[PDB]
Amino acid sequence: GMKLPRFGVEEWLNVHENSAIYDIAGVSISSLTLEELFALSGTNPEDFYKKLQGTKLNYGWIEGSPAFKKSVSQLYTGVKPEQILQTNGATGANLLVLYSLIEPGDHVISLYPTYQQLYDIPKSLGAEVDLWQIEEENGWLPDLEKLRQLIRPTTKMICINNANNPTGAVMDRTYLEELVEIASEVGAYILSDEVYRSFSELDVPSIIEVYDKGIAVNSLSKTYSLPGIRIGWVAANHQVTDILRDYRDYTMICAGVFDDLVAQLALAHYQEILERNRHILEENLAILDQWIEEEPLVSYIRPAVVSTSFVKIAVDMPMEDFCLQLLQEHGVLLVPGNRFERDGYVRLGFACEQETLIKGLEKLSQFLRRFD
Amino acid sequence: GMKLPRFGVEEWLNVHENSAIYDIAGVSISSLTLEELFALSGTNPEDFYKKLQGTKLNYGWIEGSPAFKKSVSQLYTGVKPEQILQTNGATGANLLVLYSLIEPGDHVISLYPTYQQLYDIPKSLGAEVDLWQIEEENGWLPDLEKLRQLIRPTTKMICINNANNPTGAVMDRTYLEELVEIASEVGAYILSDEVYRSFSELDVPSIIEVYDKGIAVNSLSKTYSLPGIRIGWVAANHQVTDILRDYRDYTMICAGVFDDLVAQLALAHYQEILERNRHILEENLAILDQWIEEEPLVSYIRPAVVSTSFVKIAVDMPMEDFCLQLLQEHGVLLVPGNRFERDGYVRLGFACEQETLIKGLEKLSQFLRRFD
């Protein structure tokens, strides 16, 4: 539509996901079953079902359970449970933040390309949105000097995605502190969608650990392998949290009763999930790295050990056509770079089943021999 | 905020719900537990858990399961499964419709007062919104002659809530057909939030059964006693459905895996849920009716056997103050009428536990003896 464009990755997936033989387009980490979650957590399934079975499926915990709020707060330094609001995924959290806070005429600066919510939602609300461009020559980070040129006395909000979708690149503490010093000149909020926790050795604090006006969005979908419960949160200062609480009936009311119950269990054993997911990330990333070095037509900036990557394909044809042809001919699904307004690249999600990765890559290399 | 006001009922409930001794403010029907749903459906709990336990909690059925789409389609005449999109509640469905379709400058007419999404979302998107005023003198229905005065050659959408929140009043087929004839003059969509299925004997078709450009929003929350799974849908023509599919990543991505599984089960036994809920509605409404006739300071237009009512209190004080005092002094929670811009009334949800209704009413009558 006019002030709200179709969601580009979504439209691509809607059309092509059912045609995929080897799906390396998703950017999550191999999802958990309840069975696997019980096993890694040491939970007795029968006790869980007994509790569930007798719970009224009313609106439940409007803002998330006390255990949810406490466990989430504990993932951060210096954040109280009262600063946590449960949402339907990081999706619902980004929407709740932007819809609640952004007014017509507000100036907003968004990392770009990045997750499409972060720039198109504010545009749709009448914001004036400037794009803060990532630079492949600088590790896919945008230029803080350019940010100083874009910011205005009245800038309301800067949106970032850390680590970023599609690149997997991360701003570390030193970078974030400089970003914060710039935002602090004008009292701008910084909304940081943090679904991609780096498993690298970099020091990567949450925005809210470096800035009082940092608004952290996160979820159990990408780092914790539970997209199917649709549980995320916003972490913000008391003032922001108090504003947001009065707008959740426009978008969600609340998240689900069972969904929150599973979230409580997952968060109570988050370190076990991280350990599972570290192995998948490191082993699959090593496979991707080896392949990238072996294949002369592809190269990339290695992601900060998160489940998204953005691979540069040295072939002179639009990537949408390249990916359509690869799909038709070999059944391999990628997301082409033009869907992020950076053609010449494809988004490759590698933290899927290792077998599917290997075959996908093998078949991609087969396709690439057609262009030498 | 400026183009998006706080959600009025929400703010009231956020502040006061924890102070309630006798909560007669919710407008749902006594929620089900999974145990009760298994019992009324004749399901073996162990089979359900076995299926659930081994299901990957990935993104699952993006648009809802095939069983969900088919069972929902079957609630209507002349609607195919492909016309159904699952959402996170009716909340998510209303938002998805408005956010997808409404453009800045669009003219939209909304029933008023009604569910706040239906008029404030379009305003927030830059629509010009006219209010089509319900008339207590005419059974809380708005005047079709006035609609003919408000409509314009380019009117994009008319929003209704059938039955309406807070009044419980319903437009029957004869009324709807006349509404449709007016909308058809200009090709306006009619969005109808239909969470409140009347249990009356009136002929009340869905908007989509009387109009090709009718967009039906519904859910399992109000009629089917399952708010805690957060499952709703939109039913629309093929063209509208195709538009909406490309905007769900702004708001939800999808609803939950377990949530859809429970929805499949509930819809497969919807008639059993209706039978349960008919008894609760009729028995509690008879209690409310008797009380209204016995209490000389209260009167109302009896709702069309749905779980919301709007009671006129013949006391000369703002209802927000009246309800605050009733809450402080007797612990009875209502929603005051000023939260719907009709002071002099309170919204009373009567399809709660019958015991809580009776005590709430008893205590309300105690409070009312202070004003004779």
Coordinates of N, CA, C and O in Angstrom, one line a residue, chain B residues 137-277:
Chain B
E137 N -32.6 5.3 21.6 CA -34.1 5.4 21.3 C -34.5 4.4 20.2 O -35.7 4.1 20.1
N138 N -33.5 3.9 19.4 CA -33.7 3.0 18.4 C -33.0 1.6 18.6 O -32.4 1.1 17.7
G139 N -33.1 1.1 19.9 CA -32.5 -0.2 20.2 C -31.0 -0.2 20.0 O -30.4 -1.3 19.8
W140 N -30.4 0.9 20.3 CA -28.9 1.1 20.2 C -28.4 0.9 18.7 O -27.2 0.7 18.6
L141 N -29.3 0.9 17.7 CA -28.8 0.9 16.4 C -28.6 2.3 15.9 O -29.3 3.2 16.2
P142 N -27.7 2.4 14.9 CA -27.5 3.7 14.3 C -28.5 3.9 13.2 O -29.2 3.0 12.9
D143 N -28.6 5.1 12.6 CA -29.7 5.4 11.7 C -29.1 5.3 10.3 O -28.2 6.0 9.9
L144 N -29.7 4.4 9.5 CA -29.3 4.2 8.1 C -29.5 5.5 7.3 O -28.7 5.8 6.4
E145 N -30.5 6.3 7.6 CA -30.7 7.6 6.9 C -29.5 8.5 7.2 O -29.0 9.2 6.3
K146 N -28.9 8.5 8.4 CA -27.7 9.3 8.7 C -26.5 8.7 8.0 O -25.6 9.5 7.6
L147 N -26.5 7.4 7.8 CA -25.4 6.8 7.1 C -25.4 7.4 5.6 O -24.3 7.6 5.1
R148 N -26.6 7.5 5.0 CA -26.7 8.0 3.7 C -26.2 9.5 3.6 O -25.8 9.9 2.6
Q149 N -26.2 10.2 4.7 CA -25.7 11.6 4.8 C -24.2 11.6 5.0 O -23.5 12.6 4.5
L150 N -23.6 10.6 5.7 CA -22.2 10.6 5.9 C -21.4 10.0 4.8 O -20.2 10.4 4.6
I151 N -21.9 9.1 4.0 CA -21.2 8.4 2.9 C -20.8 9.4 1.8 O -21.6 10.3 1.5
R152 N -19.7 9.1 1.2 CA -19.2 9.9 0.1 C -18.9 9.0 -1.1 O -18.7 7.8 -0.9
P153 N -18.7 9.7 -2.2 CA -18.4 8.9 -3.4 C -17.3 8.0 -3.3 O -17.2 6.9 -3.9
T154 N -16.3 8.4 -2.5 CA -15.0 7.6 -2.4 C -14.9 7.0 -1.0 O -13.7 6.5 -0.7
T155 N -15.9 6.8 -0.2 CA -15.8 6.2 1.1 C -15.2 4.8 0.9 O -15.7 4.0 0.1
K156 N -14.1 4.5 1.6 CA -13.4 3.3 1.5 C -13.9 2.1 2.3 O -13.9 1.0 1.8
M157 N -14.4 2.4 3.5 CA -14.8 1.4 4.4 C -15.7 1.9 5.5 O -15.7 3.0 5.9
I158 N -16.7 1.0 5.9 CA -17.6 1.2 7.0 C -17.3 0.1 8.0 O -17.2 -1.1 7.6
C159 N -17.1 0.5 9.2 CA -16.8 -0.4 10.3 C -17.9 -0.6 11.2 O -18.5 0.4 11.7
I160 N -18.3 -1.9 11.4 CA -19.4 -2.2 12.4 C -18.9 -3.3 13.3 O -17.9 -4.0 13.0
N161 N -19.6 -3.5 14.4 CA -19.3 -4.5 15.4 C -20.7 -5.1 15.7 O -21.6 -4.5 16.1
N162 N -20.9 -6.4 15.3 CA -22.2 -7.0 15.3 C -22.1 -8.4 15.9 O -21.6 -9.4 15.3
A163 N -22.6 -8.6 17.1 CA -23.2 -7.6 18.0 C -22.3 -6.6 18.5 O -21.1 -6.8 18.5
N164 N -22.8 -5.4 19.0 CA -21.9 -4.3 19.3 C -21.3 -4.4 20.8 O -22.0 -4.8 21.7
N165 N -20.1 -4.0 21.0 CA -19.5 -3.8 22.3 C -19.5 -2.2 22.5 O -18.8 -1.5 21.8
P166 N -20.3 -1.7 23.5 CA -20.8 -2.4 24.8 C -22.2 -2.8 24.9 O -22.6 -3.4 25.9
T167 N -23.0 -2.5 23.9 CA -24.5 -2.6 24.0 C -25.1 -4.0 23.9 O -26.2 -4.3 24.4
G168 N -24.4 -4.9 23.1 CA -24.9 -6.2 22.9 C -26.0 -6.2 21.9 O -26.7 -7.3 21.7
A169 N -26.3 -5.1 21.2 CA -27.4 -5.0 20.2 C -26.9 -5.5 18.9 O -25.7 -5.3 18.5
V170 N -27.8 -6.0 18.1 CA -27.4 -6.7 16.8 C -28.2 -6.1 15.6 O -29.4 -5.7 15.8
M171 N -27.6 -6.0 14.5 CA -28.2 -5.7 13.2 C -28.6 -7.0 12.6 O -27.8 -7.8 12.2
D172 N -29.9 -7.2 12.3 CA -30.4 -8.4 11.7 C -30.2 -8.3 10.1 O -29.7 -7.3 9.6
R173 N -30.6 -9.4 9.5 CA -30.5 -9.5 8.0 C -31.1 -8.3 7.3 O -30.5 -7.8 6.4
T174 N -32.4 -8.0 7.7 CA -33.1 -6.9 7.0 C -32.3 -5.6 7.0 O -32.1 -4.9 6.1
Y175 N -31.8 -5.3 8.2 CA -30.9 -4.1 8.4 C -29.6 -4.2 7.7 O -29.2 -3.2 7.0
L176 N -28.9 -5.3 7.8 CA -27.7 -5.5 7.1 C -27.8 -5.4 5.5 O -26.9 -4.9 4.9
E177 N -28.9 -5.9 5.0 CA -29.1 -5.8 3.5 C -29.2 -4.3 3.1 O -28.7 -4.0 2.0
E178 N -29.9 -3.5 3.9 CA -30.0 -2.1 3.6 C -28.7 -1.3 3.8 O -28.3 -0.5 2.9
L179 N -27.9 -1.7 4.8 CA -26.5 -1.2 5.0 C -25.7 -1.6 3.7 O -24.9 -0.7 3.2
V180 N -25.8 -2.8 3.3 CA -25.0 -3.3 2.1 C -25.4 -2.5 0.9 O -24.6 -2.1 0.1
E181 N -26.7 -2.3 0.7 CA -27.2 -1.5 -0.5 C -26.5 -0.1 -0.5 O -26.1 0.4 -1.6
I182 N -26.4 0.5 0.7 CA -25.7 1.8 0.8 C -24.2 1.7 0.4 O -23.7 2.5 -0.4
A183 N -23.5 0.8 1.1 CA -22.1 0.5 0.8 C -21.8 0.2 -0.7 O -20.9 0.7 -1.2
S184 N -22.7 -0.6 -1.3 CA -22.6 -0.9 -2.7 C -22.6 0.2 -3.6 O -22.1 0.1 -4.7
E185 N -23.3 1.3 -3.3 CA -23.3 2.5 -4.2 C -21.9 3.0 -4.5 O -21.8 3.6 -5.6
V186 N -21.0 2.8 -3.6 CA -19.6 3.3 -3.8 C -18.6 2.2 -3.8 O -17.4 2.5 -3.9
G187 N -18.9 0.9 -3.6 CA -17.9 -0.1 -3.5 C -17.1 -0.1 -2.2 O -16.0 -0.5 -2.1
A188 N -17.7 0.5 -1.1 CA -17.0 0.5 0.2 C -17.0 -0.9 0.8 O -17.9 -1.7 0.7
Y189 N -15.9 -1.2 1.4 CA -15.8 -2.4 2.2 C -16.6 -2.2 3.4 O -16.8 -1.1 3.9
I190 N -17.1 -3.3 4.0 CA -17.7 -3.3 5.3 C -16.9 -4.3 6.2 O -17.0 -5.5 5.9
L191 N -16.2 -3.8 7.2 CA -15.5 -4.6 8.1 C -16.5 -4.8 9.3 O -17.1 -3.8 9.8
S192 N -16.8 -6.0 9.6 CA -17.7 -6.4 10.7 C -17.0 -7.3 11.7 O -16.6 -8.4 11.4
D193 N -16.7 -6.8 12.9 CA -16.2 -7.5 14.0 C -17.4 -8.3 14.6 O -18.3 -7.7 15.2
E194 N -17.4 -9.6 14.4 CA -18.4 -10.5 14.8 C -18.1 -11.4 15.9 O -18.7 -12.5 16.0
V195 N -17.2 -11.0 16.8 CA -16.9 -11.9 18.0 C -18.1 -12.3 18.8 O -18.1 -13.3 19.4
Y196 N -19.1 -11.4 18.9 CA -20.4 -11.7 19.6 C -21.4 -12.2 18.7 O -22.3 -11.5 18.1
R197 N -21.4 -13.5 18.6 CA -22.5 -14.3 18.0 C -23.8 -14.2 18.8 O -23.8 -14.7 20.0
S198 N -24.9 -13.7 18.3 CA -26.1 -13.7 19.0 C -26.6 -15.1 19.2 O -26.6 -15.9 18.3
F199 N -27.1 -15.4 20.4 CA -27.8 -16.6 20.8 C -29.3 -16.4 20.8 O -30.1 -17.2 21.2
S200 N -29.7 -15.2 20.3 CA -31.1 -14.9 20.1 C -31.7 -15.7 18.9 O -31.0 -16.4 18.2
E201 N -33.0 -15.5 18.7 CA -33.7 -16.1 17.5 C -33.6 -15.2 16.3 O -34.1 -15.6 15.2
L202 N -33.0 -14.0 16.4 CA -32.9 -13.1 15.2 C -32.1 -13.8 14.1 O -31.1 -14.6 14.4
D203 N -32.4 -13.4 12.9 CA -31.6 -13.9 11.7 C -30.4 -12.9 11.5 O -30.6 -11.8 11.1
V204 N -29.2 -13.4 11.9 CA -28.1 -12.5 11.9 C -27.0 -13.1 11.1 O -26.0 -13.8 11.6
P205 N -27.0 -12.9 9.8 CA -25.9 -13.4 8.9 C -24.7 -12.6 9.2 O -24.7 -11.5 9.7
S206 N -23.5 -13.3 8.9 CA -22.2 -12.6 8.8 C -22.3 -11.6 7.6 O -23.0 -11.8 6.6
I207 N -21.5 -10.5 7.7 CA -21.4 -9.5 6.6 C -21.0 -10.2 5.4 O -21.5 -9.9 4.3
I208 N -20.1 -11.2 5.5 CA -19.6 -11.8 4.2 C -20.7 -12.7 3.6 O -20.5 -13.1 2.4
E209 N -21.8 -13.1 4.3 CA -22.9 -13.8 3.7 C -23.9 -12.9 3.0 O -24.8 -13.4 2.3
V210 N -23.8 -11.6 3.2 CA -24.7 -10.7 2.5 C -24.0 -9.7 1.6 O -24.6 -8.9 0.9
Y211 N -22.6 -9.7 1.5 CA -21.8 -8.7 0.7 C -20.5 -9.3 0.3 O -19.7 -9.7 1.2
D212 N -20.2 -9.3 -1.0 CA -18.9 -9.7 -1.5 C -17.7 -8.9 -0.9 O -16.6 -9.4 -0.8
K213 N -18.0 -7.7 -0.6 CA -16.9 -6.8 0.0 C -17.1 -6.7 1.5 O -16.6 -5.7 2.1
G214 N -17.8 -7.6 2.1 CA -17.9 -7.7 3.6 C -16.6 -8.5 4.0 O -16.3 -9.5 3.4
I215 N -16.1 -8.0 5.1 CA -14.8 -8.5 5.7 C -15.2 -8.9 7.1 O -15.6 -8.0 7.9
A216 N -15.3 -10.2 7.4 CA -15.7 -10.7 8.7 C -14.5 -11.0 9.6 O -13.6 -11.6 9.2
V217 N -14.6 -10.5 10.8 CA -13.6 -10.7 11.8 C -14.2 -11.5 12.9 O -15.4 -11.2 13.4
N218 N -13.6 -12.5 13.4 CA -14.2 -13.3 14.5 C -13.0 -14.0 15.3 O -11.9 -13.8 15.0
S219 N -13.4 -14.7 16.3 CA -12.4 -15.4 17.1 C -13.1 -16.4 18.1 O -14.3 -16.5 18.2
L220 N -12.2 -17.2 18.7 CA -12.7 -18.2 19.7 C -12.8 -17.6 21.1 O -13.0 -18.4 22.0
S221 N -12.6 -16.3 21.2 CA -12.4 -15.7 22.6 C -13.7 -15.4 23.3 O -13.8 -15.6 24.5
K222 N -14.7 -15.0 22.6 CA -15.9 -14.4 23.3 C -17.0 -15.4 23.2 O -17.6 -15.7 24.2
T223 N -17.3 -16.0 22.0 CA -18.4 -16.9 21.9 C -18.0 -18.4 22.3 O -18.9 -19.2 22.7
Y224 N -16.7 -18.7 22.2 CA -16.2 -20.0 22.4 C -15.3 -20.2 23.6 O -14.7 -21.3 23.8
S225 N -15.2 -19.2 24.5 CA -14.6 -19.4 25.8 C -13.1 -19.8 25.8 O -12.7 -20.4 26.8
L226 N -12.4 -19.4 24.8 CA -11.0 -19.7 24.7 C -10.1 -18.5 24.4 O -9.2 -18.5 23.5
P227 N -10.3 -17.4 25.1 CA -9.4 -16.2 24.9 C -7.9 -16.5 25.0 O -7.0 -15.9 24.2
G228 N -7.5 -17.5 25.8 CA -6.1 -17.8 26.2 C -5.3 -18.4 25.1 O -4.1 -18.6 25.3
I229 N -5.9 -18.9 24.0 CA -5.1 -19.4 22.9 C -4.8 -18.3 21.8 O -4.0 -18.5 20.9
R230 N -5.5 -17.1 22.0 CA -5.3 -16.0 21.1 C -5.4 -16.4 19.6 O -4.5 -16.3 18.8
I231 N -6.6 -16.9 19.2 CA -7.0 -17.4 17.9 C -8.2 -16.7 17.4 O -9.3 -16.9 17.9
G232 N -8.0 -16.0 16.3 CA -9.1 -15.4 15.5 C -8.9 -15.6 14.0 O -8.0 -16.4 13.6
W233 N -9.8 -15.0 13.2 CA -9.6 -15.0 11.8 C -10.2 -13.8 11.1 O -11.1 -13.1 11.7
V234 N -9.8 -13.6 9.9 CA -10.5 -12.8 8.9 C -11.0 -13.7 7.8 O -10.3 -14.6 7.3
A235 N -12.3 -13.5 7.4 CA -12.9 -14.1 6.3 C -13.2 -12.9 5.3 O -13.8 -12.0 5.7
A236 N -12.7 -13.1 4.1 CA -12.9 -12.0 3.1 C -12.9 -12.6 1.7 O -12.7 -13.7 1.5
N237 N -13.3 -11.7 0.7 CA -13.1 -12.2 -0.7 C -11.7 -12.5 -1.1 O -10.7 -12.2 -0.4
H238 N -11.5 -13.2 -2.2 CA -10.2 -13.7 -2.6 C -9.2 -12.5 -2.8 O -8.0 -12.6 -2.5
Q239 N -9.7 -11.4 -3.3 CA -8.8 -10.2 -3.6 C -8.3 -9.7 -2.3 O -7.1 -9.4 -2.1
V240 N -9.2 -9.4 -1.3 CA -8.8 -8.9 0.0 C -7.9 -9.9 0.7 O -6.8 -9.4 1.2
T241 N -8.2 -11.1 0.7 CA -7.4 -12.1 1.4 C -6.0 -12.1 0.8 O -5.0 -12.2 1.5
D242 N -5.9 -12.0 -0.5 CA -4.6 -11.9 -1.2 C -3.8 -10.7 -0.8 O -2.5 -10.8 -0.7
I243 N -4.4 -9.6 -0.5 CA -3.7 -8.4 0.0 C -3.2 -8.6 1.4 O -2.0 -8.4 1.7
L244 N -4.1 -9.1 2.2 CA -3.8 -9.2 3.7 C -2.6 -10.1 3.9 O -1.8 -9.9 4.8
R245 N -2.4 -11.1 3.1 CA -1.4 -12.2 3.3 C 0.0 -11.6 3.3 O 0.9 -12.2 3.8
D246 N 0.2 -10.4 2.7 CA 1.5 -9.8 2.5 C 1.8 -8.8 3.6 O 2.9 -8.1 3.5
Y247 N 1.0 -8.7 4.6 CA 1.2 -7.7 5.7 C 1.2 -8.3 7.1 O 1.5 -7.7 8.1
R248 N 1.0 -9.7 7.2 CA 1.0 -10.3 8.5 C 2.4 -10.3 9.3 O 2.4 -10.3 10.5
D249 N 3.5 -10.1 8.6 CA 4.8 -10.0 9.3 C 4.9 -8.6 10.0 O 5.8 -8.4 10.8
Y250 N 4.1 -7.7 9.7 CA 4.2 -6.4 10.4 C 3.6 -6.6 11.8 O 3.9 -5.8 12.7
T251 N 2.6 -7.5 12.0 CA 1.9 -7.5 13.2 C 2.0 -8.8 14.0 O 1.8 -8.8 15.2
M252 N 2.1 -10.0 13.3 CA 2.0 -11.2 14.0 C 3.0 -12.4 13.5 O 3.4 -13.2 14.3
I253 N 3.3 -12.3 12.2 CA 3.8 -13.5 11.4 C 2.8 -14.6 11.3 O 2.3 -15.0 10.2
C254 N 2.4 -15.2 12.5 CA 1.5 -16.2 12.6 C 1.0 -16.3 14.1 O 1.6 -15.7 15.0
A255 N 0.0 -17.1 14.3 CA -0.4 -17.5 15.6 C 0.3 -18.7 16.1 O 1.1 -19.3 15.3
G256 N 0.0 -19.2 17.3 CA 0.9 -20.2 17.9 C 0.6 -21.7 17.4 O -0.6 -21.9 17.0
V257 N 1.5 -22.5 17.4 CA 1.4 -24.0 17.1 C 0.3 -24.7 18.0 O -0.6 -25.3 17.5
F258 N 0.5 -24.6 19.3 CA -0.5 -25.2 20.3 C -1.8 -24.5 20.1 O -2.8 -25.1 20.2
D259 N -1.7 -23.2 19.9 CA -2.9 -22.4 19.9 C -3.9 -22.8 18.7 O -5.1 -23.0 18.8
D260 N -3.3 -23.0 17.5 CA -3.9 -23.6 16.4 C -4.5 -25.0 16.6 O -5.5 -25.4 16.1
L261 N -3.7 -25.8 17.3 CA -4.1 -27.2 17.6 C -5.3 -27.2 18.4 O -6.3 -28.0 18.2
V262 N -5.4 -26.4 19.5 CA -6.6 -26.3 20.3 C -7.7 -25.7 19.5 O -8.8 -26.2 19.6
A263 N -7.4 -24.8 18.6 CA -8.5 -24.2 17.8 C -9.1 -25.2 16.9 O -10.3 -25.2 16.7
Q264 N -8.3 -26.1 16.3 CA -8.8 -27.2 15.5 C -9.8 -28.1 16.3 O -10.9 -28.4 15.8
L265 N -9.4 -28.5 17.5 CA -10.3 -29.2 18.4 C -11.6 -28.5 18.7 O -12.7 -29.1 18.7
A266 N -11.5 -27.3 19.1 CA -12.6 -26.5 19.5 C -13.6 -26.3 18.3 O -14.8 -26.5 18.5
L267 N -13.1 -26.0 17.2 CA -13.9 -25.8 16.0 C -14.6 -27.1 15.5 O -15.8 -27.1 15.1
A268 N -13.9 -28.2 15.7 CA -14.5 -29.5 15.4 C -15.6 -29.9 16.3 O -16.4 -30.7 16.0
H269 N -15.7 -29.2 17.4 CA -16.8 -29.5 18.4 C -17.5 -28.2 18.8 O -17.9 -28.0 19.9
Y270 N -17.6 -27.3 17.8 CA -18.1 -25.9 18.1 C -19.6 -26.0 18.6 O -19.9 -25.2 19.5
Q271 N -20.4 -26.9 18.1 CA -21.7 -27.0 18.6 C -21.9 -27.4 20.0 O -22.8 -26.9 20.7
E272 N -20.9 -28.2 20.5 CA -20.9 -28.5 21.9 C -20.5 -27.3 22.8 O -21.1 -27.2 23.9
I273 N -19.6 -26.5 22.4 CA -19.3 -25.3 23.1 C -20.5 -24.3 23.1 O -20.8 -23.7 24.1
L274 N -21.2 -24.2 21.9 CA -22.3 -23.3 21.8 C -23.4 -23.8 22.8 O -24.1 -22.9 23.5
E275 N -23.6 -25.1 23.0 CA -24.6 -25.6 23.9 C -24.3 -25.3 25.3 O -25.2 -24.8 26.1
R276 N -23.0 -25.5 25.7 CA -22.5 -25.1 27.0 C -22.8 -23.6 27.3 O -23.3 -23.2 28.3
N277 N -22.4 -22.8 26.3 CA -22.5 -21.3 26.5 C -23.8 -20.7 26.4 O -24.1 -19.7 27.1

